Design an enzyme around this catalytic site. Structure first.
Site, PDB file in Angstrom:
ATOM      1  N   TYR A  56     -27.710 109.188  49.900  1.00  0.00           N
ATOM      2  CA  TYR A  56     -27.212 110.570  49.790  1.00  0.00           C
ATOM      3  C   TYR A  56     -27.390 111.103  48.370  1.00  0.00           C
ATOM      4  CZ  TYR A  56     -25.102 110.486  54.417  1.00  0.00           C
ATOM      5  OH  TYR A  56     -24.914 110.439  55.775  1.00  0.00           O
ATOM      6  N   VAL A 105     -26.314 105.792  43.068  1.00  0.00           N
ATOM      7  CA  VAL A 105     -25.111 104.991  42.854  1.00  0.00           C
ATOM      8  C   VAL A 105     -25.161 104.248  41.524  1.00  0.00           C
ATOM      9  CG1 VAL A 105     -23.607 103.212  43.790  1.00  0.00           C
ATOM     10  CG2 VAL A 105     -24.842 104.747  45.333  1.00  0.00           C
ATOM     11  N   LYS A 158     -20.836 106.824  43.440  1.00  0.00           N
ATOM     12  CA  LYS A 158     -21.962 107.481  44.086  1.00  0.00           C
ATOM     13  C   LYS A 158     -22.001 108.949  43.675  1.00  0.00           C
ATOM     14  CE  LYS A 158     -24.198 108.073  48.520  1.00  0.00           C
ATOM     15  NZ  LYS A 158     -24.132 107.774  49.962  1.00  0.00           N
ATOM     16  N   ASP A 169     -26.516 103.933  59.330  1.00  0.00           N
ATOM     17  CA  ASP A 169     -27.596 103.669  58.378  1.00  0.00           C
ATOM     18  C   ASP A 169     -27.606 102.211  57.932  1.00  0.00           C
ATOM     19  OD1 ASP A 169     -29.823 104.427  56.701  1.00  0.00           O
ATOM     20  OD2 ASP A 169     -28.411 104.562  55.001  1.00  0.00           O
ATOM     21  N   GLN A 200     -29.836  96.760  52.307  1.00  0.00           N
ATOM     22  CA  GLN A 200     -29.371  97.350  51.049  1.00  0.00           C
ATOM     23  C   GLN A 200     -27.943  97.925  51.174  1.00  0.00           C
ATOM     24  OE1 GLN A 200     -32.215  97.814  52.717  1.00  0.00           O
ATOM     25  NE2 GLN A 200     -33.880  97.112  51.381  1.00  0.00           N
ATOM     26  N   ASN A 201     -27.494  98.125  52.413  1.00  0.00           N
ATOM     27  CA  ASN A 201     -26.140  98.617  52.687  1.00  0.00           C
ATOM     28  C   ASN A 201     -25.148  97.494  52.998  1.00  0.00           C
ATOM     29  OD1 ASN A 201     -28.012 101.033  53.266  1.00  0.00           O
ATOM     30  ND2 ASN A 201     -26.004 102.016  53.413  1.00  0.00           N
TER      31      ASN A 201
HETATM   32  N1  LIG Z   1     -28.471  93.753  41.923  1.00  0.00           N
HETATM   33  S1  LIG Z   1     -28.417  94.163  43.474  1.00  0.00           S
HETATM   34  O1  LIG Z   1     -29.644  94.786  43.889  1.00  0.00           O
HETATM   35  O2  LIG Z   1     -28.344  93.015  44.419  1.00  0.00           O
HETATM   36  C1  LIG Z   1     -26.998  95.176  43.765  1.00  0.00           C
HETATM   37  C2  LIG Z   1     -27.079  96.260  44.688  1.00  0.00           C
HETATM   38  C3  LIG Z   1     -25.990  97.015  44.910  1.00  0.00           C
HETATM   39  C4  LIG Z   1     -24.795  96.723  44.211  1.00  0.00           C
HETATM   40  N2  LIG Z   1     -23.620  97.570  44.450  1.00  0.00           N
HETATM   41  N3  LIG Z   1     -23.749  98.494  45.242  1.00  0.00           N
HETATM   42  C5  LIG Z   1     -22.667  99.176  45.917  1.00  0.00           C
HETATM   43  C6  LIG Z   1     -23.030 100.223  46.807  1.00  0.00           C
HETATM   44  C7  LIG Z   1     -22.023 100.902  47.488  1.00  0.00           C
HETATM   45  C8  LIG Z   1     -20.693 100.535  47.292  1.00  0.00           C
HETATM   46  O3  LIG Z   1     -19.711 101.185  47.959  1.00  0.00           O
HETATM   47  N4  LIG Z   1     -20.364  99.515  46.429  1.00  0.00           N
HETATM   48  C9  LIG Z   1     -21.287  98.850  45.745  1.00  0.00           C
HETATM   49  O4  LIG Z   1     -20.915  97.948  44.996  1.00  0.00           O
HETATM   50  C10 LIG Z   1     -24.710  95.646  43.294  1.00  0.00           C
HETATM   51  C11 LIG Z   1     -25.814  94.880  43.082  1.00  0.00           C
END
Ligand SMILES: NS(=O)(=O)c1ccc(/N=N/c2ccc(O)[nH]c2=O)cc1
Length: 294
Positions: A15, A18, A33, A123, A127-128
């Site tokens: 959307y 983040v 976000k 969705d 990645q989610n």
């Molecule tokens: N380094 S990594 O690609 O594995 C990675 C990816 C996403 C991440 N945190 N993302 C979030 C997304 C949405 C949410 O509500 N909370 C999060 O921590 C934290 C680390």
């Protein structure tokens, strides 16, 4: 905000963008976000404020919703790694079966919860899905019925993904059922096992045809009503359903059985999250802890 020090750009999450951020007053570390005018949609604020009341250990907590500076900020609980990074990190070794099974089980518990409150993720993709060092996996970044779009991207930008979309959506269905999330989770399950995306389409028709090549071109016998769907075409090629043992080897028959029920064409035959929790695959489910390199 001034209230939040951006630490690191985490991703571009369906959307907007983040960030990992720290509350400069309280010190808590969160996911922030950012959604970039003209007084945007009151009707989103109510299905969003609805997301706030979702309370379950396998669902990332929406902490607050701040509308300011002609922007919408969503403040979320933070976890340190997503499933995609974890799958890439273990692509040579494989994710051990008990951990795959634990993750699938927890995500079904999460969906069973959402779906019983009439909330769909819409969705679901690696990645989610966020993991921590305690063996937990959590559904994140729920998509909205409309919100800001439905765009053809998070925004702008980059890589919209069809890979985890249920066939009834690709066939033009207007009203989603909880079944679309089971389909996505089925695709993710296959991907954890094989370490390759199950249906990596390059367009909407290619996505649909990749599903047809694997599961067979659907017809009235396996999916009553399909030939009357808005985007169904009689000119679709007729692919034979290829044998399912080729789909997710070397997964055992319990796992293949469950996957098969999560990937049924007919959204009414497709297994529900709660019925899935009862599948013999979970007879020996445990809770391993991942080895995480943070
Ligand atoms: N380094 S990594 O690609 O594995 C990675 C990816 C996403 C991440 N945190 N993302 C979030 C997304 C949405 C949410 O509500 N909370 C999060 O921590 C934290 C680390």
């Amino acid at each position: 905000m001034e209230n939040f020090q951006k630490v690191e750009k985490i991703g571009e999450g369906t959307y907007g963008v983040v960030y990992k951020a720290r509350n400069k007053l309280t010190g808590e570390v969160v996911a922030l976000k950012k959604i970039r005018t003209e007084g945007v949609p009151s009707t989103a604020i109510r299905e969003i404020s609805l997301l706030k009341e979702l309370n379950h250990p396998n669902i990332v907590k929406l902490l607050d919703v701040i509308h300011t500076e002609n922007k919408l900020y969503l403040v979320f609980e933070f976890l340190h790694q997503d499933l995609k990074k974890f799958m890439d990190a273990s692509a040579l070794t494989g994710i051990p079966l008990p951990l795959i099974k634990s993750y699938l089980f927890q995500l079904l518990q999460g969906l069973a919860f959402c779906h019983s409150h009439r909330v769909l993720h819409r969705d679901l993709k690696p990645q989610n899905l966020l993991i921590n060092t305690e063996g937990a996996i959590k559904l994140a970044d729920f998509g909205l019925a409309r919100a800001f779009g439905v765009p053809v991207r998070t925004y702008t930008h980059e890589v919209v993904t069809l890979w985890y979309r249920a066939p009834e959506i690709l066939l033009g269905c207007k009203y989603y059922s909880t079944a679309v999330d089971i389909w996505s989770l089925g695709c993710i399950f296959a991907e954890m096992v094989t370490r390759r995306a199950l249906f990596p389409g390059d367009s909407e028709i290619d996505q649909l045809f990749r599903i047809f090549r694997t599961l067979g071109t659907p017809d009235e016998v396996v999916w009553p009503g399909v030939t009357s769907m808005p985007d169904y075409k009689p000119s679709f090629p007729k692919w034979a359903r290829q044998d399912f043992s080729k789909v997710v080897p070397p997964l055992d028959e319990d796992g293949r059985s469950l996957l098969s029920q999560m990937l049924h064409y007919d959204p009414n035959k497709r297994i529900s999250a709660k019925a899935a929790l009862a599948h013999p695959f979970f007879q020996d489910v445990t809770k391993p802890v991942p080895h995480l390199r943070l």
